[PDB]
Design a protein around this ligand. Sequence first.
Ligand SMILES: [Zn+2]
Ligand SMILES: [Zn+2]
Ligand SMILES: [Zn+2]
Length: 84
Amino acid sequence: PYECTLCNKTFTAKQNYVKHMFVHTGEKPHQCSICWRSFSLKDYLIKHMVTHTGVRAYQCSICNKRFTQKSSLNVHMRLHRGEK
DNA sequence: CAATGTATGGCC
DNA sequence: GGCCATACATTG
Ligand SMILES: [Zn+2]
Ligand SMILES: [Zn+2]
Ligand SMILES: [Zn+2]
């Protein structure tokens, strides 16, 4: 079972374990070509670029409202939830 | 592995 | 309320 001994935390697979340990280094090699903000992992930088592009790719199919991140949309769906 | 999905919470 | 970073997951 993959486990970070600093946090005492388990991971299901190796990939997130390696990413977690690299975040533990403190290094931020992935930088934005626009605002020069640096990031631990490329995943985070990819999500960052949407703030510059303005694309709200994630749309509620109930009320047509649009969102920057899928997580925001998922949160929003709790508002339509509560009606059977 | 990358892509995609979920979850959290400070900040405006 | 949602933007946004951060951090975990499963899927292909
Ligand atoms: Zn750790
Ligand atoms: Zn930037
Ligand atoms: Zn909606």
